[PDB]
Each structure stands twice: as structure tokens, then as C-alpha cells.
From a paper:
The arenavirus surface glycoprotein complex (GPC) is the target of neutralizing antibodies. GPC comprises three functional subunits: the stable signal peptide (SSP), GP1, and GP2.9 GP1 binds cellular receptor(s), and GP2 contains a transmembrane domain (TM) and mediates membrane fusion. During attachment of New World arenaviruses to their cellular receptor transferrin receptor 1 (TfR1),10–12 a GP1 pocket accepts a tyrosine (Tyr211TfR1) that is conserved in all TfR1 orthologs that can support the entry of these viruses. We determined X-ray crystal structures of JUNV GP1 with the weakly cross-reactive antibody Fab and of MACV GP1 with the potently cross-neutralizing antibody Fab.
A complex of MACV GP1/CR1-07 Fab crystallized in the P42212 space group, with diffraction extending to 3.9 Å. CDR L1 and CDR H3 clasp the C-terminal segment of GP1 loop 3, and CDR L1 forms additional contacts with the GP1 β-4 strand. Comparison with the GD01 structure shows that the angle of approach is different and that the tip of CR1-07 CDR H3 shifts away from the GP1 Tyr211TfR1 pocket. Instead of engaging the cavity, two tyrosines in CR1-07 CDR H3 interact with Ile115 and Val117 on the rim of the pocket; these are the only two pocket residues conserved in MACV and JUNV GP1; MACV GP1 residues Arg111, Ser113, and Thr216 are respectively replaced by a serine, aspartate, and lysine in JUNV GP1. The other GP1 residues CR1-07 contacts are conserved between JUNV and MACV GP1, but not among the other viruses. CR1-07 binds with high affinity to JUNV GP1mut, a construct in which Ile115 and Val117 are replaced by tyrosines. This suggests that CR1-07 would nonetheless tolerate substitutions at these positions and that most of its binding energy is contributed by conserved contacts elsewhere in the RBS. On the other hand, the drastically different angle of approach of the CR1-07 Fab allows its CDRs to avoid any clashes with MACV loop 10. Efficient cross-neutralization is thus achieved by avoidance of the MACV loop 10 insert, a unique segment that best exemplifies the extensive sequence variability seen within the RBS of New World arenaviruses. CR1-07 would approach GPC with a steeper angle, with its CDR L1 forming contacts near the trimer apex.
Residue numbers in the entry:
A (entry chain R): 87 to 238
B (entry chain B): 2 to 138, 145 to 225
C (entry chain A): 1 to 221
């Protein structure tokens, strides 16, 4: 079942959930907003982020593979599949006093999943983990077989 | 805060036009912008969206690939390049600012709107109006028919701006021909008909017509 | 995608009374859980020519500076915009808008006018000018001047045979002072046909008229 991983550069990581492909990048830019977007509480909310049902699981694996504990840890924000902006899932991994701890979590998890990961974050500055399904408008050119050749 | 649309007039089907929107009173370079059109009818329809940096541009399926949204943050100006125009594109084009905070995804909430610029697409070339009188027969009605003209608008004044009270100038009606027809009337006391001189002063700037016709009783 | 339908097309209320626009969406626009229940619905005011303005968002939250007489309400599929006490200034078109799904969609909008006492129309007929008759066409015009409500029936009659399709109507916007309307009805005929008939009549049926009013002429004159 397991989703095959891969990396290209310092802010270009990938995941393949059977047939589907997912692009994992780090950003400093708070793209998705609280109060406007879908909070993900449990794995069942995930189906509201992807067109497919056979997408939901790969995401669910990875989030938990990172260190996300659904019961206590903060809900990740996601862009509804109603908005034709694409499918976006972001984790608030900021080095700010609030999500200070959660920041350390997902980062250690990443360093464990991807040998080639280094903390790109700035101290006392916002930091986010953005994921996009491949084929989506939000995923762009980065999901082409030009970038995806360099991988397993 | 200010949004002022410019450009837009009359075009032949298939030709191109460019609309610009001048922005002031907010941080233009950081906010998401939109183009919403209103066709003669009622419907308010979304046309395009652009990000603060132009990386993400989205179009409505009706315009997709014919229109091109662009922006110049240095001049705080928004642009819509409209090519291969069709009659269906006839609308007032409003430029609007998205409520979405900086670097946030589009909220599709239109906080501020401009006054809008009219864009008319028709194959009808420019034609001047033919002005016929609506001859009167305790109060009397006098008038002017302003038939077969293109494009809109036409300006009617009575007694060169002296006659004002009880002047009803009806909105233009587009005929089968694709040419506009308009009517203008004025209620006057019956007693004045014999004395007073009544002349409507019609002005259609696109065909450069200026006419002024005297309405004589029957 | 989502279809916003608004109702009633145009309403008229006395100064001070309550105005009530209805808005209905084809799919719910509600997002729930956390604790928060938000309705992805907005209201806009558009006076003539002027820039449309944002009134309400989240279906109930007033945009900064909107007076408290404007009340946004509803949930899921059914929404209502209420103007607690109508002011002359409040005359405009009002549009509801969905922002739950892409693309954002708007209503057809209700038009808000003032409700005033019945006012009978003054009826007038005009024969085609000789100037126009030499031009090869003929235009008979009928004016309904200063009346309320907008609703009235104009029937054209040529030699006692009723006319259809050959006429066009035009109506002024409710007057700024007396809030009455005026109507233009133009019967367009071929010079040829016009000369073959004698009696030309225009029949107005209104709320303010005791009985239909007829304005007519003979071609002989
Ligand atoms: C993601 O996490 C950061 C850190 O907790 C949030 O940023 C802080 O927001 C609070 C309340 O608005 C402020 O008092 C802090 O000063 C902000 N910290 C920073 C780093 O400047 C951030 O808002 C969260 N994401 C969103 C958009 O909700």
C-alpha cells in the first residue's frame, strides 16, 4: 500500500499515493487562512481536499508519519475542493511561541523521512508545509515528467 | 480609497480593446484584484482574478483564452486585454478589490468596486439620427422622435436648455436593424402653443450630428 | 455550479416601512464544526451609475459603516436582506452573492422603489410626421404621462384590428420628486400599409382609470 517518497532540491519533496502524485514544499508565505478555510480534525475531513477517495489515505499516512496526533495537535488547514484554486493542505510549523513545539515535531519527522532535509525556517518567523496533488492548478509545472524523471 | 476604470467604447465583433483600472487609497501591490462584468439585463458575472505578483490568474469559462489579465504594481494599475470580442461581451466592466488579506488565497469577497466602463460589441457601424416631430393636437404634449442611430448615446434638450420642467426623455430602444430609436417629450400649457416656439436640440457626438427641429402644432 | 436566484424582481415600500428581499441558493453555502457555522453569502447595494458597494458578508456581518437599519439574515439555502426603515437614499438594486464554491455567483437582484398612491396616466397620441412619411416609414407614438403603478396595458388598433409584434415600449425610471412613471409606445408601420388604413387608436388600461381610455385619429385628419 505504502506511498513512495523522493526529493529534488532543498524545498522540493514528492510522494506517490498509488496512481496519484503529491508535491511537498516548504513556504514562509501564509497562503491558506484561518477562518476562511477547512480545519482538518480527523482523517475523514481529508476527503474534502481531494477529488478522489483513493488520495485521502496517502495524505493521512504521511501526516501521521510526520508526528501529527489528531486528538491533541493543531488541525491542519486545507483548501476546499469547491474552490478551483487547487487542493492545498498546510501545516502551521512556525518558529513563533504558539506553534513553537509543533514546528519542532513535523521538522524532526521530515528529517527522518527525507535524509536530505535541513531546517529552512527562521527563528521568530512564520514557516509552513504546503502539499498539492499533481495535475491541479496550484501544483503547476513542478509536477511535469521533466522534474519527476530525476526521481524513482 | 479609489478605483477608476478607463478605456472601453464600441468595437466591431472580432476586434480588440484594452481596459485599465487606476488604484489608490490601499496597498495595491499586496491585494488580489478582480474584473466583474454586468451585461445589459441584470446579471452580475465574474470574469477574472489576478494575484499580487501575477503568478496565479484565473478566468471565467466564457472569456478563458480570449481575455488576458495583467497588472503594473509600480503604477498601481490593473489591466484586462480583450481580444476576439463577441456581442455576448457587451457589459459594464467593474474592477474590484478582494477582501482577502495579504498573500492569502482569494476570498471571492469584493470589498471595493470602481464606477465601471462600458464595452459595447456590435457590427453596426456609426449612423446619425433622423429627428421627426411629435406634433401636438388644459395641458398639451410636444415631442421629438430620434430614430435610427448608432451607437448610444444621444442628448436631447428643449429650447436650448431653457425648457426644463416636465421634460421626459425615454430610454433608447434597440430595433431589429441593430439601430437605436429614442423619444423625448414635454408637457406645456395649451395656451402657450400659439405664442411660444418649441425646438428640441438633439446631439449625437459619435456621428457628429447636431440637429434642432421645431415642433409645429397641427 | 451554484445558482443564486433572487426574489421579488422589484418591490415598492412606503418611506419608513420594512423592505424584505429573498435570496435562494441551488446548493447550501454553509461550512460547519469547530464550533463555527459560517454562511458564504454577501449582499451588495448598487444605486444608478454608481459603484456597487459591499453591505453584508458571512450573510449577517455588516461591512464597516453600513447603518444598523440594514439587517442580513438566513442560513444554508435561504437568505433575507431587511431594511428596517426605508429612506429615500435606500432606493437601489440589491444583489446577493455566493463565495462558497468557485466560481463566485450573483443574483438577478431585486430593485427597491418607493410605494406611492395610485396616479392615473394622462394619454396622448401622435401621428407620423410628413417628413418621416416621405422617408418611406411611419411611426405612431403613444404617451402615458406621470402615473403609478408601472403596470398598465397599451393596445394598438388599426381599423379596429388589434396590433401585435409591431410595437415597442420604453419606461422612465420612477421620478425623483413625485415617484411616478411615464411610458412611450411606438407603433412602427410601412408607409404603404399606413396609407391603406384610416383609424389609428391607442387604448390604455390602468388602475387609476375608471374605464379604458382611448386616444385615436383618422388618416384624413
Ligand atoms: C500560524 O502560526 C503563527 C505562530 O503562532 C501565527 O502567527 C501569530 O499570530 C498571532 C495572532 O494573530 C500573533 O499574536 C503573533 O504575533 C503571530 N506570530 C508571528 C510569527 O508573527 C499565524 O497567524 C498562524 N497562521 C494563521 C494565518 O492563522
Amino acid at each position: 500500500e505504502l506511498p513512495s517518497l523522493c526529493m529534488l532540491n532543498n524545498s522540493f519533496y514528492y510522494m506517490r499515493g498509488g496512481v496519484n502524485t503529491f508535491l511537498i514544499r516548504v513556504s514562509d508565505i501564509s497562503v491558506l487562512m484561518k477562518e476562511y478555510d477547512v480545519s482538518i480534525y480527523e482523517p475523514e475531513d481529508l476527503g474534502n481536499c481531494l477529488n478522489k477517495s483513493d488520495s485521502s489515505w496517502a495524505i493521512h499516512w504521511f501526516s501521521n508519519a510526520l508526528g501529527h496526533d489528531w486528538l491533541m495537535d493543531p488541525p491542519m488547514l486545507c483548501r476546499n475542493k469547491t474552490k478551483k484554486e487547487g487542493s492545498n493542505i498546510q501545516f502551521n510549523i512556525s518558529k513563533a511561541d504558539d506553534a513553537r513545539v509543533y514546528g519542532k515535531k513535523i521538522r524532526n519527522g521530515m528529517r527522518h523521512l527525507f535524509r536530505g532535509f535541513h531546517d529552512p525556517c527562521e527563528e521568530g518567523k512564520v514557516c509552513y508545509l504546503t502539499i498539492n496533488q499533481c495535475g491541479d492548478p496550484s501544483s503547476f509545472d513542478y509536477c511535469g515528467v521533466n522534474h519527476l524523471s530525476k526521481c524513482q | 480609497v479609489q478605483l477608476v476604470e478607463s478605456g472601453g467604447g464600441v468595437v466591431h465583433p472580432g476586434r480588440s480593446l484594452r481596459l485599465s483600472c487606476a488604484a489608490s487609497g490601499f496597498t495595491f501591490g499586496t491585494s488580489i484584484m478582480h474584473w466583474v462584468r454586468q451585461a445589459p439585463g441584470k446579471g452580475m458575472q465574474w470574469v477574472a482574478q489576478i494575484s499580487h505578483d501575477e503568478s496565479r490568474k484565473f478566468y471565467s469559462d466564457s472569456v478563458k483564452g480570449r481575455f488576458t489579465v495583467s497588472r503594473d504594481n509600480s503604477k498601481n494599475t490593473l489591466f484586462l486585454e480583450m481580444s476576439s470580442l463577441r456581442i455576448e461581451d457587451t457589459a459594464v466592466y467593474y474592477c474590484a478589490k478582494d477582501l482577502s488579506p495579504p498573500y492569502s488565497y482569494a476570498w471571492d469577497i469584493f470589498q471595493y468596486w470602481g464606477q465601471g466602463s462600458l464595452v459595447t460589441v456590435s457590427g453596426a457601424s456609426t449612423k446619425g439620427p433622423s429627428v421627426f416631430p411629435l406634433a401636438p393636437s388644459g395641458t398639451a404634449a410636444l415631442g421629438c422622435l430620434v430614430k435610427d442611430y448608432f451607437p448610444e448615446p444621444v442628448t436631447v434638450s428643449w429650447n436650448s436648455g431653457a425648457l426644463t420642467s416636465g421634460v421626459h426623455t425615454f430610454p433608447a430602444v434597440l430595433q431589429s436593424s441593430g439601430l437605436y430609436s429614442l423619444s423625448s417629450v414635454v408637457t406645456v400649457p395649451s395656451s402657450s402653443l400659439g405664442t411660444q416656439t418649441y425646438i428640441c436640440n438633439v446631439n449625437h457626438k459619435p456621428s457628429n450630428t447636431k440637429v434642432d427641429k421645431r415642433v409645429e402644432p397641427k | 455550479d451554484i445558482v443564486m436566484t433572487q426574489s421579488p424582481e422589484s418591490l415598492a415600500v412606503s418611506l419608513g416601512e420594512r423592505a424584505t428581499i429573498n435570496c435562494k441558493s441551488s446548493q447550501s453555502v454553509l461550512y460547519s464544526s469547530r464550533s463555527d457555522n459560517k454562511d458564504y453569502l454577501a449582499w451588495y447595494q448598487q444605486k444608478p451609475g454608481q459603484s456597487p458597494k459591499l453591505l453584508i458578508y458571512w450573510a449577517s456581518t455588516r461591512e464597516s459603516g453600513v447603518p444598523e437599519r440594514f439587517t442580513g439574515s438566513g442560513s444554508g439555502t435561504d437568505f433575507t436582506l431587511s431594511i428596517s426603515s426605508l429612506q429615500a437614499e435606500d432606493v437601489a438594486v440589491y444583489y446577493c452573492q455566493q463565495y462558497y464554491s468557485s466560481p463566485p455567483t450573483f443574483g438577478g437582484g431585486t430593485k427597491v422603489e418607493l410605494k406611492r398612491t395610485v396616479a392615473a396616466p394622462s394619454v396622448f397620441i401622435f401621428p407620423p410626421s410628413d417628413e418621416q412619411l416621405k422617408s418611406g416609414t411611419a411611426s405612431v407614438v403613444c404617451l402615458l404621462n406621470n402615473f403609478y403603478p408601472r403596470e398598465a396595458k397599451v393596445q394598438w388598433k388599426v381599423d379596429n384590428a388589434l396590433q401585435s409584434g409591431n410595437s415597442q415600449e420604453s419606461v422612465t425610471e420612477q421620478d425623483s420628486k413625485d415617484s411616478t412613471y411615464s411610458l412611450s409606445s411606438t407603433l412602427t408601420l410601412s408607409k404603404a400599409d399606413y396609407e391603406k388604413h384610416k383609424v389609428y387608436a391607442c387604448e390604455v388600461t390602468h388602475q387609476g382609470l375608471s374605464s379604458p381610455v382611448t386616444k385615436s385619429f383618422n388618416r384624413g385628419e
